[PDB]
């Protein structure tokens, strides 16, 4: 934070010379001094440089051209306004939030003015920093405790060791010194929710629209379990999204509960859709309780909102309709929903309290905001028993939390506060929409096939576009209306190969091939299905990254159409098996994999495998207890009908749980087995395109086994 | 790592001028040159500066004076040896580990030699760095993945925000870029135990004497639960140290198990002693199983080794005697035991496999080695079902681990490896012993009272000194021999106030007053009891911190004997309650508090409180289930006899569990209540010396309540 | 390969100052920075100077005027394109072979951008160098074999002799160190057609429109005899 802008040629030495003097005085204080040419140049400087922390200008010349524009960008940004005898305040300024200091033009005043600017810069810094992080930085600057844990004592133990010195030097002093413990009494305590930690939690709850917020330092994996353990006593029944993260399987394995699954929909691409509205109705649930051994009325429900591919629920509908006293939205993918009105009514915290219910979001701050790995938040709307909730929190929280992770969780909130926060989120939405429109444009303009974007036929509006039953784009048959919405920032691209019907085209380019090409060019694909690719247009992704991705896609098409050798176009793939890929061309690879997909009927098998559930013979908890007693064995995948599965089976595609521990494939659920067998067969053909089923094990002879409970 | 030492005046220009040329060439490559005066000056430079990464010298003049001494300090340290025509290799060098390059004295060769030195320095760095940390640092320098989580994208996202830029600037680019995910495929995966992660685990197991080691990123709080949950299925019985960390109480609250408690001893100071040898013998356990409802033969045993105050067990005895197939040493306080022979036979991993048993250590690498907060290791000796063990591991491990914490765990191993590592731990043992001897010396030399050290009458040997039944220093009655040992690095200081009999002295200085004094001077007291203070002489604590502590203790005596005003001697205490402390002097404070301890009979009540056990009415798991159903209420502490406790009650002193959830104080265990009532009374008198009982709540009228289950 | 061209007057400090900063950061990495007046000046600079290895320019201002013309001269030439908020890719670029990195105008970003340019320059060099030559140059920079023929050992033996030192100094270190033998096993072998030598032969064959190519080190005088002796056994007739 050291860049000061000076805006001006004034034509009078009595103004210009004191400004030259101020330039020199500011440089002596280690500011860097920048000179925009005009009003628009200055606004671009502010917009492009977060470290620009002050603006010097002639008041009469510029106030009516600058003040309103600046206030929209940054409420808090120091203005250093130089006054004329008759300078005054226009009524248009009355309601603007501005930080203004007024100065005179005088020779010899520069040193004093520079000192005031320095002081006002520190006040700005202290205004924008949140409380715990501010306290942590101050401690690192000023503090001096010894005989403390961490045993490394601000990195001291590292410096006495050759390898330790490399480690210390890599991370640097501030990182090492900020790794502290509750011995630093002035920072309070995470587990006690005291001092600056209490201030951080209250600060976060305000920013994120929660009644109460908890900082978790072991990821949403852990936040999910804290919420679940508080919410679901032994002997109870819970409703759980079949599209649930593995941490919720772990919760079920650790807690003696009976699950009843919400059943999401899916399209022909293998993309998950929303749990239909009928799944939330009392009659539906009551009947499933009746049909489930040992089930009672659910005390807790867990819903994944949004889906991975960006489908958000009408959460107003869910909260009004779902007659369960505790509703937890696993919101790991959507930590930013409070920061744009486009997400209103589409996130757990939206709106107010619900009578007789507590609502939660868990969020992975590190995924789609800016925070260190393992940073997570629990947001609560409604009443909890605070002591009992804290026991559950403490059961999963270390006694030695990492303060960097904690500070980063609080600073993520600070970043999202106000106009600078709204602008960060708006910008990610705008850039996602810009890129979405570019794909559609290039699809029209290019010669022959192109990528498509999975979205409405027109996106002339900035909103989470509703999925409507009268539109074919989303692929979900007979969808509920006013139920699901597409998050603009979750951009799904489609490769040729499937028709509007959900039927197969003659020409196809399996998305795995495009992903391989992108990885050559350092672009990671978050998620891939047979003909789909997901890109997260997060606040991380700037215009430069968006352009690089767009250019890589036009280059894929250009190179594909030239039919380059695999050896040249996909060197990393070639290196996996040069002899196999020596003479193969890209169009041949695409054709062959596509024909495999078609021949094996993969999309239809994948649809049918997930449309029926395996039978719950025992709960995940009960199955794991069996495993703990050594009562598992391996059988060939082919032999698993009528056996109780020990491990979750999670195939890619489509990357969601297929079989839970304690479930059995029966005749009712035979397509589960056939899908798994097909994945094993199709994966045996192309090096680099191997079968990937978590819970299935390739044997030396190329058959797969799975782990089942002993009879 | 950029300091190169040149050792010499040779008296011939043909040698001196090329070395002048090399000095310049090396400065151009950004090395610092240093010029020791002689052999001993060079060795001190190496001893004091881990970043000294090369030594240049005339081979004939120095090799017989340097090579052996250097090899004893650093096996790997590059030597750049300048040879004469007749230079040869002495037979004494044959078995030394040395890294030597031979060079000639020639004008114009310096640029080439300097380039070879640069290359050799990089090889040295690559030799000493462990595999995962090396890969991480290399990725940071060279990698270029975009469209990646963490969403901050090497800190990118922070730089677009004013407050974010401050956070980025504080931690720095390396810290930000090293926060990565499994998208960086060349680093493999923690959860899959693959690539450099697998290399890290094997490297660690080798360094720490384990068959298998796991890196945990949520502290030993979590490592304890991973081991416990693998080891103790629902319905089972476990043997658990009554001196158990809260994480083990949480384990019992989360797992449907029945505890039987090992019963530690204690002394009149309130310092915990070891579980007696009789507690481990078959007939003792069999009888307890018979007397405990629902108990069966224990499948798993948990022992805290060492105690907080440094008492280590004869673990050879435990392993031979304890007829339980799974024995877990919670070794959070002693992660360094594999690095000095003084700990052989006194730690979990010591020795070889135990037939028919699996042995664990869990260790908080961040407490007494050098690693980031939350870094923990599980060490296994014996067979586990690797796949079931991994499920329990994954159940408590995030899907987005913090790679800094992971790299710090592996680097802690790299630091402890070999001669560098033996020297580090030897150093800390030597310093602890030096300081112990200094207290004994000052006690003799000083005028009137002084501190004492809780240790044997003679410590003229470097070992973990055995506690003997024929010695009275440790205060334990009828102790088993060849059973408990005192770790040199855990230094307990005693303040005046108790006689050798365990009776009270007329003159006392409660240790709490000394702790408040030390805290004024930025010295943290790890643990305090009525008349004891614990200091950890970790590899953090250098000679400078040891002298600062010794001086602070002499200053405490000096200022105490002058009888300074509390206002002047303890200003932070004074500003607690200025009006209360306005005229009080230090000796009066010490006297008054000591008289209170004496009047209330605190040591006798504390001893008796912990010698009986509350009655286990239900297991902690069953008690927590009741709390989860809302079935708790608050009663006054005075009315708790015959009530089932909902919370753990943990009083300070002596800082170990007194009552577990599910336990009830009866007439048989009334001393528990008497002790707690006394702590409440004694704590009402002096601001800053308040009652501290976890599980008891001070009401506005000064009465205390506890949480119990509803009748 | 160390000349970088910057093309421009933009009229806004928010763009010009970051480019000034980038100038300085690049000179610190030992690049030389040239400033063409306009599009045609830049194209002449590229045409006349093979060691011009990168071009920095404002994307919007120049992409439609530069990208096709550059792709006609050099497929592989690094372009460092500075983007505006609304910068996009014209359909006319689709089939051009371009190497483009996109950057933002920001104060204090120059050190990072200059390092990325350095990296891209090394990637460009490694793209255009063929496999054996690239391996040879890397060995000279990095290798350390001893007890090696040629007996001169990277020119070492020459430096011990007054006349030898003159010979070494004339040809220079790279020439002397690149005179190696099959002892440098990572370069494979000409006679075995192995390793980078096999890659060189296949590279050559493709460039020259051959099924197979052989590298001969004793002139076409010798290449003629190799072909001839394989082709014409004793007692045969040749045209
Ligand atoms: N403190 C302060 N606030 C002002 C001022 N002028 C406008 N505001 C706005 O008012 C908010 C404080 O509103 P209050 O009514 O005082 O607080 P409350 O909403 O928590 O009850 C600030 O929100 P915020 O918490 O700063 O964050 P955000 O909502 O702007 O992101 C800020 O947006 C001012 O002069 N001082
Ligand atoms: N690589 C290598 N090792 C040598 C050499 N000379 C002695 N050593 C020592 O030998 C150890 C390796 O012993 P091995 O028999 O190869 O491996 P093992 O102990 O794992 O079976 C090294 O231990 P370490 O794992 O490096 O650590 P530490 O035991 O010294 O702490 C090091 O102490 C050598 O020339 N090269």
Residue reference for tokens 């807690």: A255
Query: For residue A248, how far is its CA from the centre of ligand 1 (angstroms)?
Result: 38
Q: Which of A288, A333, A291, A286 is nearest to A312 (CA)?
A: A333
Whether the Cβ atoms of residue A60 and residue A84 lie closer than 8 Å to each other:
yes
Task: Determine the Cα–Cα distance for residues C139 and C119; give it in Å rounded to an integer.
Answer: 20
* Option in A179, A369, A647 nearest B151 (CB): A369
* Measured distance between the N- and C-terminal CA atoms of chain A, rounded to whole angstroms: 68
Chains that contact A by 3+ CB pairs under 8 Å?
A: B, C
Residue reference for tokens 């190496």: B46
Whether B210 and B291 share a structural domain: yes
DSSP per-residue codes, B258-327: EEEEE---B-TT--B-PPPGGGGSHHHHHHHHHHSTT--S-SEEEEESS-TTSEEE-HHHHHHH---SEE
Whether B203 and B325 share a structural domain: yes
Locate the ligand 1 atom nearest the alpha carbon of residue A207 and give its number. 31
What radius of gyration, in Å, describes the C-alpha atoms of chain B?
29
Whether B466 and B482 share a structural domain: yes
Cis peptide before C150 (omega within 30 of 0): yes
Select the residue from B164, B373, B523, B524 to test the A interface by mutation, using most A Cβ atoms within 10 A: B373
Task: Determine the Cα–Cα distance for residues B162 and A99; give it in Å rounded to an integer.
Answer: 15
Cis peptide before A654 (omega within 30 of 0): yes
Locate the ligand 2 atom nearest the alpha carbon of residue B207 and give its number. 31
Whether B409 and B492 share a structural domain: no
Angle (CA) A186 A187 A192, round 5°: 110
Locate the ligand 2 atom nearest the alpha carbon of residue B417 and give its number. 31
Cis peptide before A569 (omega within 30 of 0): no
Q: Residue A173 corresponds to which tokens in the numbers above?
A: 């002093």
The CATH code of the domain that includes A222 is: 3.40.640.10
Whether A578 and A611 share a structural domain: no
Whether the Cβ atoms of residue B672 and residue B609 lie closer than 8 Å to each other:
yes
Whether A81 and A118 share a structural domain: yes
Task: Determine the Cα–Cα distance for residues B195 and B391; give it in Å rounded to an integer.
Answer: 19
Other CB atoms within 10 Å distance of the CB of residue B569: 22
Classified as helix, coil or strand, A627 is: helix
Angle (CA) B339 B340 B344, round 5°: 105
Largest CA distance in chain A: 97
DSSP single-letter state for residue C129: S
Q: Which of B127, B128, B132 is nearest to B406 (CA)?
A: B132
By C-alpha distance, the chain A residue nearest C84 is: A543
By C-alpha distance, the chain B residue nearest A539 is: B157
Whether the Cβ atoms of residue A594 and residue A509 lie closer than 8 Å to each other:
yes
Chain C closest-CA separation from residue A591 CA (Å)? 22
Whether the Cβ atoms of residue A308 and residue A270 lie closer than 8 Å to each other:
no
The CATH code of the domain that includes C83 is: 3.40.50.2300
DSSP per-residue codes, A440-498: HHHHHHSSS---EESS-S---S-S-EEP-TT--TT--TTPPSSSEEE-TTEEEEE-SSB
Chain B closest-CA separation from residue A506 CA (Å)? 31
Which residues of chain A are at the C interface, by a Cβ-Cβ cutoff of 8 Å? 3, 32, 34-37, 40-41, 44-45, 48-49, 51-52, 434, 438, 442, 445-447, 542-545, 547-548, 550-551, 554, 557-558
Paired residues of B52 in beta bridges: B3
Of B530, B559, B594, the one marking the end of a domain is B594
Q: Residue A472 corresponds to which tokens in the numbers above?
A: 């074919």
Q: Residue A11 corresponds to which tokens in the numbers above?
A: 């034509």
The backbone region for A448, taken as left when phi is positive above 0, alpha when psi lies in -120 to 50, beta otherwise, is left
Other CB atoms within 10 Å distance of the CB of residue A573: 24
DSSP-derived pairing of the beta strands B452-453 and B376-381:
unpaired
Residues of B in contact with A218 (CB under 8 A): 217-218, 222, 398
Whether the Cβ atoms of residue A607 and residue A529 lie closer than 8 Å to each other:
no
Whether the Cβ atoms of residue B67 and residue B47 lie closer than 8 Å to each other:
no
Residue B165, CB-side half-sphere exposure with 13 Å CA sphere: 19
Angle (CA) A186 A191 A194, round 5°: 40
Of B92, B113, B129, the one marking the end of a domain is B129
Q: Residue B419 corresponds to which tokens in the numbers above?
A: 């001669």
Whether A540 and A660 share a structural domain: no
Q: Which of A258, A256, A253, A259 is nearest to A628 (CA)?
A: A253
Paired residues of A504 in beta bridges: A498
Phi and psi of C175, rounded to 5°? -60, -45
**A446/C104 CB distance under 8 A:** no
Phi and psi of B633, rounded to 5°? -145, 165
Task: Determine the Cα–Cα distance for residues A184 and A139; give it in Å rounded to an integer.
Answer: 8
DSSP H/E element including B559: helix B543-561
What radius of gyration, in Å, describes the C-alpha atoms of chain A?
29
Task: Determine the Cα–Cα distance for residues B439 and B547; give it in Å rounded to an integer.
Answer: 11
Q: For A188-244, where are the alpha helices, taking DSSP H only?
A: 196-207, 219-231
Task: Determine the Cα–Cα distance for residues A88 and B185; give it in Å rounded to an integer.
Answer: 62
Locate the ligand 1 atom nearest the alpha carbon of residue A416 and give its number. 31
If you take atom 5 of ligand 2, which residue's CA is the nearest one?
A: B97
DSSP H/E element including B72: helix B59-73
Task: Determine the Cα–Cα distance for residues C114 and A664; give it in Å rounded to an integer.
Answer: 59
Q: Residue A640 corresponds to which tokens in the numbers above?
A: 């698993």
Phi and psi of B567, rounded to 5°? -50, -35
Chain C closest-CA separation from residue A34 CA (Å)? 8
Residues of B in contact with A154 (CB under 8 A): none
What radius of gyration, in Å, describes the C-alpha atoms of chain C?
24
Phi and psi of A377, rounded to 5°? -130, 140
Whether the Cβ atoms of residue A470 and residue A513 lie closer than 8 Å to each other:
no
Whether the Cβ atoms of residue B77 and residue B100 lie closer than 8 Å to each other:
no
Task: Determine the Cα–Cα distance for residues A58 and B541; give it in Å rounded to an integer.
Answer: 57
Whether A125 and A246 share a structural domain: no
Whether the Cβ atoms of residue A198 and residue A188 lie closer than 8 Å to each other:
yes
Angle (CA) A102 A108 A113, round 5°: 35
Instruction: Sort A437 into a burial class: Cβ within 10 Å, 0-12 / 13-18 / 19+.
Output: middle
Whether A392 and A450 share a structural domain: no
Of B405, B424, B443, the one marking the end of a domain is B424
Residue reference for tokens 């605070």: A386
Whether B244 and B297 share a structural domain: yes
Whether the Cβ atoms of residue A328 and residue A227 lie closer than 8 Å to each other:
yes
Mutate to test the pocket of ligand 1, among A199, A209, A413, A417 (most ligand atoms within 8 A of CB): A417
Query: For residue B55, how far is its CA from the centre of ligand 2 (angstroms)?
Result: 23
Whether A655 and A537 share a structural domain: no
If you take atom 11 of ligand 2, which residue's CA is the nearest one?
A: B418
Angle (CA) B306 B307 B309, round 5°: 115
Residues followed by a gap in chain C, C→N > 2.5 Å: none
Chain B closest-CA separation from residue A660 CA (Å)? 14
Cis peptide before A564 (omega within 30 of 0): no
DSSP per-residue codes, A32-79: EEE--SSHHHHHHHHHH-TTEEEEEEEHHHHHHHHHHHHHHH-TT-EE
Tell me the residue range of the domain where B335 lies: 130-424
C-alpha distances out from residue A325 to A382, A622, B651, Å: 10, 25, 37
Task: Determine the Cα–Cα distance for residues A190 and A186; give it in Å rounded to an integer.
Answer: 12
Whether the Cβ atoms of residue B508 and residue A130 lie closer than 8 Å to each other:
no
Q: Residue B374 corresponds to which tokens in the numbers above?
A: 């939350």
Query: For residue B133, how far is its CA from the centre of ligand 2 (angstroms)?
Result: 20
Paired residues of C4 in beta bridges: C33, C54
Q: Which of A557, A403, C133 is nearest to B170 (CA)?
A: A403
Whether the Cβ atoms of residue B666 and residue B644 lie closer than 8 Å to each other:
no
Task: Determine the Cα–Cα distance for residues C97 and C67; give it in Å rounded to an integer.
Answer: 9
**C83/A547 CB distance under 8 A:** yes
Q: Residue B415 corresponds to which tokens in the numbers above?
A: 């630091």
Q: Which of C43, B399, B180, C55 is nearest to A246 (CA)?
A: B399
Residues of A in contact with C100 (CB under 8 A): 551
Other CB atoms within 10 Å distance of the CB of residue B12: 9
Q: For C75-211, where are the alpha helices, taking DSSP H only?
A: 110-128, 131-142, 156-159, 162-171, 173-177, 196-208
Considering every ligand atom, which ligand is closest to the CA of A128?
1
Paired residues of C57 in beta bridges: C7, C81
Q: Which of B280-288's residues contact partners 24+ apart within 8 Å by CB, and which partners?
A: B280/B317, B280/B318, B280/B321, B280/B322, B281/B321, B282/B323, B285/B239, B285/B260, B285/B323, B288/B260
Q: For A586-668, where are the alpha helices, taking DSSP H only?
A: 586-599, 602-611, 620-628
The whole-angstrom distance between residue B87's C-alpha and the CA centroid of its chain comes to 49
**C13/A36 CB distance under 8 A:** yes
C-alpha distances out from residue A517 to A568, B143, B183, B186, C198, Å: 11, 17, 15, 17, 26
Residue reference for tokens 């001190």: B44
Our answer on whether the CB atom of B206 is closer than 6 Å to any ligand 2 atom is yes
Our answer on whether the CB atom of B417 is closer than 6 Å to any ligand 2 atom is yes
Residues of A in contact with C83 (CB under 8 A): 543-544, 547
Task: Determine the Cα–Cα distance for residues B595 and B510; give it in Å rounded to an integer.
Answer: 10
Mutate to test the pocket of ligand 2, among B128, B129, B418 (most ligand atoms within 8 A of CB): B418
Whether the Cβ atoms of residue A436 and residue A459 lie closer than 8 Å to each other:
yes
**B172/A169 CB distance under 8 A:** no
DSSP per-residue codes, B674-692: HHHHHHHHHTTSSTT---E
The CATH code of the domain that includes B682 is: 3.90.100.10
Classified as helix, coil or strand, C22 is: helix
C-alpha distances out from residue B471 to A103, B456, B474, Å: 80, 8, 7
C-alpha distances out from residue B187 to A124, A452, A650, Å: 40, 33, 23
The whole-angstrom distance between residue B563's C-alpha and the CA centroid of its chain comes to 37
Task: Determine the Cα–Cα distance for residues B347 and B306; give it in Å rounded to an integer.
Answer: 8
Whether A172 and A248 share a structural domain: yes
Our answer on whether the CB atom of A97 is closer than 6 Å to any ligand 1 atom is yes
Count of domains observed in chain B: 4
Whether the Cβ atoms of residue B536 and residue B306 lie closer than 8 Å to each other:
no
Task: Determine the Cα–Cα distance for residues B130 and B213; give it in Å rounded to an integer.
Answer: 15
Task: Determine the Cα–Cα distance for residues B309 and B342; give it in Å rounded to an integer.
Answer: 17
Paired residues of B214 in beta bridges: B378
DSSP H/E element including A360: strand A358-363
Task: Determine the Cα–Cα distance for residues B693 and B680; give it in Å rounded to an integer.
Answer: 9
Residues of A in contact with B391 (CB under 8 A): 253, 624, 627, 647
Other CB atoms within 10 Å distance of the CB of residue A165: 21
A·B CB contacts under 8 A: 343
Q: Which of A445, A442, A426 is nearest to A547 (CA)?
A: A442
Task: Determine the Cα–Cα distance for residues A318 and A275; give it in Å rounded to an integer.
Answer: 10
Our answer on whether the CB atom of A138 is closer than 6 Å to any ligand 1 atom is no
Residue reference for tokens 């990637």: C123
The CATH code of the domain that includes A479 is: 3.90.1150.10
Q: Which of A30, A42, A49, A37 is nearest to A5 (CA)?
A: A42
Angle (CA) A654 A657 A660, round 5°: 155
**Cα torsion B593, B597, B603, B606: sign:** negative
């Amino acid at each position: 934070m050291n860049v000061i802008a000076i805006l001006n040629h004034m034509g009078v030495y009595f103004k210009e010379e004191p400004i030259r003097e101020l330039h020199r005085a500011l440089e002596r204080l280690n500011f860097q001094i920048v000179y925009p040419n005009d009003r628009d140049d200055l606004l671009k400087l502010i917009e492009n440089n977060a470290r620009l922390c002050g603006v010097i200008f002639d008041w009469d010349k510029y106030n009516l051209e600058l003040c309103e524009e600046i206030s929209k960008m940054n409420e808090n940004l120091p203005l250093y306004a130089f006054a004329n005898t008759y300078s005054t305040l226009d009524v248009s300024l009355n309601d603007l939030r501005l930080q203004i200091s007024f100065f005179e033009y005088a020779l010899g005043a520069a040193e004093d003015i520079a000192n005031k600017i320095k002081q006002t810069t520190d006040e700005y810094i202290n205004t924008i920093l949140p409380p715990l992080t501010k306290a942590l930085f101050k401690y690192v600057r000023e503090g001096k405790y010894t005989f403390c844990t961490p045993g490394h004592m601000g990195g001291t133990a590292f410096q006495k060791s050759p390898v330790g010195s490399l480690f210390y030097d890599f991370f640097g002093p501030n990182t090492m010194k900020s790794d502290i413990s509750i011995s630093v009494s002035e920072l309070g305590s995470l587990l006690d929710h005291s001092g600056p930690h209490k201030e951080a939690e209250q600060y976060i709850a305000r920013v994120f629209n929660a009644d109460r917020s908890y900082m978790v330092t072991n990821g949403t994996s852990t936040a999910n379990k804290i919420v679940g353990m508080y919410s679901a006593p032994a002997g109870s029944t819970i409703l759980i999204d079949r599209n649930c993260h593995k941490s919720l399987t772990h919760l079920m394995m650790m807690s003696d509960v009976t699950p009843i699954y919400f059943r999401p929909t899916r399209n022909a691409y293998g993309i998950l859709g929303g749990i239909p509205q009928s799944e939330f109705q009392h009659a539906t649930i009551a009947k499933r309780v009746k049909e489930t051994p040992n089930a009672t009325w659910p005390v807790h429900a867990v819903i994944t909102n949004s889906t991975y591919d960006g489908l958000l629920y009408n959460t107003d509908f869910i909260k009004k309709t779902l007659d369960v006293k505790s509703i937890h939205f696993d919101s790991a993918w959507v930590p930013y929903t409070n920061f744009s009105p486009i997400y209103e009514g589409k996130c757990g915290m939206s709106g107010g309290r619900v009578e007789g219910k507590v609502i939660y979001e868990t969020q992975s701050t590190h995924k789609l905001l800016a925070a260190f790995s393992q940073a997570s938040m629990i947001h609560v709307k409604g009443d909890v028993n605070e002591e009992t909730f804290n026991e559950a929190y403490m059961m999963h929280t270390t006694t030695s939390p990492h303060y960097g992770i904690v500070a980063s969780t609080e600073t993520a909130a600070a970043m999202m506060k106000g106009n600078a926060g709204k602008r960060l989120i708006n910008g990610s939405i705008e850039r996602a929409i810009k890129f979405r429109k570019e794909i559609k444009r290039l699809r029209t303009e290019s010669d022959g096939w192109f990528f498509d974007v999975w979205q409405p036929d027109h996106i002339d509006t900035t909103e989470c576009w509703p999925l409507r039953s009268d539109s074919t784009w989303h692929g979900f048959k007979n969808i509920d209306n006013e139920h699901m919405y597409l998050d603009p920032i979750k951009v799904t691209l489609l490769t040729p190969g499937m028709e509007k019907d959900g039927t197969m085209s003659d020409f196809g380019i399996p998305a795995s091939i495009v992903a391989k090409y992108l990885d050559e060019h350092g672009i990671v694909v978050e998620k891939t299905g047979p003909y789909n690719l997901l890109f997260l247009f997060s606040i991380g992704i700037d215009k430069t990254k968006a352009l690089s991705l767009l250019r890589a896609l036009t280059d894929f098409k250009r190179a594909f159409d030239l039919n380059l050798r695999v050896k040249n176009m996909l060197p990393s793939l070639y290196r996996e098996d040069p002899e196999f890929y020596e003479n193969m061309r890209i169009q041949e690879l695409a054709q062959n994999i596509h024909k495999l997909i078609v021949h094996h009927n993969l999309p239809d098998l994948m649809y049918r495998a997930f449309e029926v559930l395996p039978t719950m013979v025992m709960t995940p908890y009960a199955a794991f207890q069996k495993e703990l007693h050594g009562m598992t064995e391996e059988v060939y995948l082919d032999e698993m009908v009528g056996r109780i599965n020990a491990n979750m089976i999670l195939p890619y595609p489509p990357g969601v749980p297929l079989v839970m521990p304690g479930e059995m494939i029966t005749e009712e659920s035979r397509p589960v087995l056939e899908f798994l067998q097909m994945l094993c067969e199709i994966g045996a053909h192309y090096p680099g395109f191997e079968t990937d089923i978590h819970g299935a094990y390739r044997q030396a002879d190329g058959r797969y086994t799975v782990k089942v409970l002993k009879e």
